[PDB]
Each structure stands twice: as C-alpha cells, then as structure tokens.
Amino acid sequence: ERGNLDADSESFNKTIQSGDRVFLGEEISTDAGLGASNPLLTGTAGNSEGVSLDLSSPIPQTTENQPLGTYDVDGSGSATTPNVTLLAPRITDSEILTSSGGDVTGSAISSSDAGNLYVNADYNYESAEKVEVTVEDPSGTDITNEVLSGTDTFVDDGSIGSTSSTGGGVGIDMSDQDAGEYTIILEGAEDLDFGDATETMTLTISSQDEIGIELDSESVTQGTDVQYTVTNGIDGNEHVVAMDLSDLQNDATTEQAKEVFRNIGDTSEVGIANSSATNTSGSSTGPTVETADIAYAVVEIDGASAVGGIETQYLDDS
C-alpha cells in the first residue's frame, strides 16, 4: 500500500495512483500503475504551468527547472484526469531521549546511563518511504547492528516524546561501546537521502563521570568575580552548590551574605539554609546569618554543563 506503508510490511512503494503526492527525489515505477498508463504530464497552473514532468526518468532535485505544483496530462485543466501534486521532502524534528525523558543530543552522556536511549523523529515523507538510522563510530564505521535493541531500523511518523518501545522510535543500548564521538545519520530508505532529507545528530560518550566543577581561574583576590561551571550532569535535574559559612568574613551582615551567589547563568534560587529552615533571596524570613550554617544556590543544567558565578569580596584570605 502507499500512504499506509506498514500495512504490508513493505519498506518502500513506488506505484503511484491518480491523485496522490510525489516527492522530488523519487524514482516512479514504470512497471504498473501511473508509470505506464501516462508516462509524461504537464503543469496545470501557476509557475508549474507549461512545464513538462516525465515520470519515467528520475524527477530532478534543486526545485529549479522543475517548479513545484500540480501536473495534469492534458495541460491546464480542472476536470478529473490523471493528476499529481509535487511536494518537497523534509524531516521536521529529531531527538534522542533518555528512558526517563529529556534530550541529551549534542551533549556528553555517562556510559553507565547510556543503556536505554531512544531516537524519535517527525518527518514529512511518510506515505512513500520510511527513514533509516545509521550510527557511526568516531572512526567512521556503521555500528547500527551492534547497538540495535529488538526493533527494526524503521522509525515511524510522529512518536516524538515516546519513552517506551511501544511507540515509534528505535532503542539503542550504548553502554558497551567505548568513549568517543558518535554520529547518528537519518536518511530516506531508498532515494530521499539528499539535502534537507538527512540529518546528522552528534553524541558524545565519556566515562569520566563524576559531577565536575571547574573555575576559569584559581588564584584571585577579593572582589574579583569568578565563573564556575558544572560538567557531566543529567539534563533537566537541579544540583546544589554549597558554601561553608566559616569562610565568610566575620564582619558580614544578614543582607551582606545573601549576595555571595549571583543569579548568573542557569541558577534558579539563591539563599542561606540552616539544618531545618532556609532563608531564600526572596525575603529575610528564615534563619539569620549567625543562625544559618550553609549558603546554597540551586542550579539547573541545560545540556551537558551549567555556568554560575561567585563574588570573592567579603571572603577570608584562605
């Protein structure tokens, strides 16, 4: 069938019936259907008017010399006749989601947690051909057969956000492979693999996997703002950066201590916390500077890393 490709377990179908849609890079079948009953057609209206489409030869790409439109054998017409509408190929969206959920595309993921990944996408060309997935190692070799987990290479239309194998999408168990940069390639099953019909999504595998913290500088004076970055963390989850109140200057006040952490970067909330109660940056309602014991700044992460900042002013020289 065409339009319902999986009803017959066929990877591709190239028999076109009157009224359907045809894409730019297709290779119509001349054996049966509208490939031998009407080989050549002409434009009907608009820019397409007057131009000639030959079904037997591969339809040209580039959308130049073959303007998009509707084609009718007779010429400009409105009566029922063998006609077809040319449309461009496209894949609107693609993503790699962890089993829990959340995108990790273009970002390094721990080897331990990279064991139940999923790939989902939305594409325009579902009536003609499904879209293939090909995982490539940093060396440049097809590793699809090694990481596949019980599902055929074909991914269905829609099914974006599907965290389960029941919905369309392919499951990859990337735990066994070593550290490196891997590229997932999506392209049409047979012919629709040219520009705008293919996408290369990167993914980084690494095993240094403790939640990491780095500073642009280590030796600084008071008052110099320092930006700190958290690395190798789960996306969509909130970490906590702490500050020992012993390091604060003795002569600080309550309002003077709530400005140690800035709201810079991905930080959501800042404040000081006692063992049982907290005093956030919104209001001076919780514990006081002497009453509280820790200073915190809850920080999210977007991607593989998040950035915050500190103010070395009012800090002891140690």
Stretch that binds a second copy, among 28-36, 67-75, 247-255, 271-279 (CB under 8 A): 67-75
Binding residue (CB under 8 A) for a second copy from 16, 23, 34, 44 = 44
* Residue 258 interacts with which of a second copy, ligand BGC, none, CB < 5 to 8 Å by class: none
- Identify which of residues 29 and 81 has a Cβ nearer to ligand BGC in the complex: 29
Q: Which residues bind ligand BGC (CB under 6 A)?
A: 1-2, 13, 15
Binding residue (CB under 8 A) for a second copy from 10, 30, 61, 69 = 69
Q: How much is the CA Rg of the chain, to the nearest whole Å? A: 29
212 binds a second copy (CB under 8 A): no
- Shortest distance in whole angstroms from residue 23 CB to a second copy: 12
* Residue 2 interacts with which of ligand BGC, a second copy, none, CB < 5 to 8 Å by class: ligand BGC
CA distance 223 to 43: 72
Residues 228-267 that bind a second copy (CB under 8 A): 262-265
Binding residue (CB under 8 A) for a second copy from 9, 65, 276, 283 = 65
- Identify which of residues 43 and 188 has a Cβ nearer to ligand BGC in the complex: 188
Q: How many CB atoms lie within 10 A of CB 167?
A: 14
Stretch that binds a second copy, among 85-93, 183-191, 231-239, 285-293 (CB under 8 A): 85-93
- Identify which of residues 33 and 43 has a Cβ nearer to ligand BGC in the complex: 33
Which among 117, 160, 116, 96 has a CA at the least distance from the CA of 303?
A: 96
Which stretches of the chain bind a second copy, using CB under 8 A?
A: 43-52, 54, 57-58, 60, 63-65, 67-70, 76, 85, 87-88, 90, 92-93, 111-112, 122, 124, 139, 141-143, 145-146, 178-179, 207-210, 225, 227, 262-265, 307, 309
